[PDB]
C-alpha cells in the first residue's frame, strides 16, 4: 500500500510506528509538518491529533492501534495469544508513564516540577519493574524481539534526555536497549532519521 | 480457564473486562477488594496496578489489554485487521480522554478545576468528533457491535456522572448508548451489577 505517517518533526508518538516500517522493510512517507502549518492542518484530523497514517486515502489514527495493525501476523506481534497480551500490557504501562508528562505546558515553572517529580518519584518504579519482569531474559516477551522491545528502546531515550543516570541500577535494560539497536534494520533508521531532542 | 478479576469496588477499569465477560457468557470471579486490602496485594503485582485478570493463576495487567485478549477471534473484535484498528483507535481516543483527570491528585480545587476545565471545555469537542466518526452509522465500527462501542458506553456513563447535559447536542450518541445497553447480555448485567458511584 501507500503510506503516509504525518507527524511533528521529532521522534515522539511516531517514532514506534518508524521503526515497524523500518524493521518490516516497508515503504513509506514520512511527512513532517511545520508548527507553522500545524493549527490550520490541526482542523482536517479525526480527533484533532497526530500522528496520522493514511493507506490508500484511508486515515488512520492513534499510534499504538496503528502499530499493532501494521505488526499483525508478522515476528514483532507476539507468538501466542497470551503473549501478544504481554506485549500490549507492556506498551500500555509504558505508554500510561510517558502521557502523565505535561509536554504542552505553558507555564515553565510548572513543568519543571511536574517533570522532575516524575522523573525522580515515578521513572524509578517503573524501572524497577521493567527489569524484574525482564529478569535475565533476552527480551521483553517471548523467545525474540517484539514491538514492545521497541517501544521499551524509543520511550527510555526520550527519558534519558531528562535523566541521564536512570538505568546506573539497571544494566539489564540498559542492555536491551542495545539489543535493539543493534537490529540492522533499526540500526540503519537510527542512523538515518532526523535529528532531533525529542 | 478459571477467571479471577480483581479490582476496587466501582466500575472504573475493570468495567470493559465485565461487559465482555457478560456478553460472552463467560464465568469469572469478581473480585472487588476495600482499599485497606491494597496496599498487600499491591506488593504481590508485578507492576503494582489494578485490575489484574488472573488466567489459570498467571497475571494479566492493563485493562484494555485484556479486553483485546478476551475479545480476540470473537464478533466484538472487529472483523478485519482495518476494522480492528479502527476499533483500537477509538479505544484509546476514549481512554486516552479518561486518563486525563486527575483521580488520585492530593490536592482537591487543582483536582476539581482541572475536572471543570476537561468536563467544559475539552469534553463537548471530544463528543463532536465522536458523533462525526460515527457519520450516521448504526455503531462506531462496521456493521455491528465491537467492544469499542461498549467502552463508548462505559466512558460516557462516567462522564455524564459529573456533566449531565454531555450528549444534550448528541442525539445519536444518546441513540447509541441506548443500543449498547438493550444487547441483551449487556441488559442483564447493567441491571444486575453493584451501583457503585463510579
Ligand atoms: O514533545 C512532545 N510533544 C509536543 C507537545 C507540544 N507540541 C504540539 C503542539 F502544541 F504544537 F501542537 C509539539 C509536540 C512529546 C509528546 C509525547 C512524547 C512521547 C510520547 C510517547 C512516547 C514517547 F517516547 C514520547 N514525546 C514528545
Ligand atoms: O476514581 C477512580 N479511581 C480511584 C481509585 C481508588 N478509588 C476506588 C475506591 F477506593 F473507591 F474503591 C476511587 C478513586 C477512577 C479511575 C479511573 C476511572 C476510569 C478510567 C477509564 C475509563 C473509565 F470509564 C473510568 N474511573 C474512576
Ligand atoms: N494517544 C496518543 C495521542 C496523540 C497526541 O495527543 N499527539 C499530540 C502530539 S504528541 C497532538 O496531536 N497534540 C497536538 C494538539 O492537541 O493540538 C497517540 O499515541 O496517538
Ligand atoms: N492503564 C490503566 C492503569 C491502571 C491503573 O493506574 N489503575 C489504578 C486504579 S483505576 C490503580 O491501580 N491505582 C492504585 C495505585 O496506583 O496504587 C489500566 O487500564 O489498567
Ligand atoms: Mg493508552
Redesign the interface.
Given at each position: 500500500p501507500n503510506y503516509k505517517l504525518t507527524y511533528f518533526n521529532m521522534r515522539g508518538r511516531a517514532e514506534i510506528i518508524r521503526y515497524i516500517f523500518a524493521y518490516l522493510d516497508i515503504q513509506y512517507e514520512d511527512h513532517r509538518i511545520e508548527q507553522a502549518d500545524w493549527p490550520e492542518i490541526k482542523s482536517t484530523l479525526?480527533?484533532?491529533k497526530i500522528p496520522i497514517l493514511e493507506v490508500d486515502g484511508?486515515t488512520?489514527?492513534?499510534s499504538?492501534?496503528?502499530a499493532?495493525?501494521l505488526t499483525?501476523?508478522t515476528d514483532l506481534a507476539g507468538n501466542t495469544?497470551?503473549e501478544?497480551?504481554?506485549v500490549?500490557?507492556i506498551?500500555?504501562?509504558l505508554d500510561?508513564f510517558m502521557?502523565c508528562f505535561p509536554w504542552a505546558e505553558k507555564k515553565q515553572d510548572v513543568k519543571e516540577q511536574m517533570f522532575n517529580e516524575l522523573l525522580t518519584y515515578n521513572a524509578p518504579?517503573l524501572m524497577q519493574?521493567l527489569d524484574?519482569?525482564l529478569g535475565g531474559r533476552e527480551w521483553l516477551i517471548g523467545n525474540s524481539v517484539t514491538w514492545a522491545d521497541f517501544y521499551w528502546e524509543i520511550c527510555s531515550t526520550t527519558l534519558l534526555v531528562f535523566k541521564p543516570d536512570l538505568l546506573d541500577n539497571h544494566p539489564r535494560l540498559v542492555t536491551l536497549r542495545k539489543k535493539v539497536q543493534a537490529i540492522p534494520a533499526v540500526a540503519n533508521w537510527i542512523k538515518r532519521r532526523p535529528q532531533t531532542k525529542l
Open positions: 479525526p480527533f484533532g484511508l488512520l489514527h492513534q499504538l492501534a496503528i499493532r495493525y499483525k501476523n495469544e497470551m501478544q497480551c504481554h500490549d500490557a506498551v500500555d504501562t500510561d502521557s518504579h519493574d524484574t519482569y
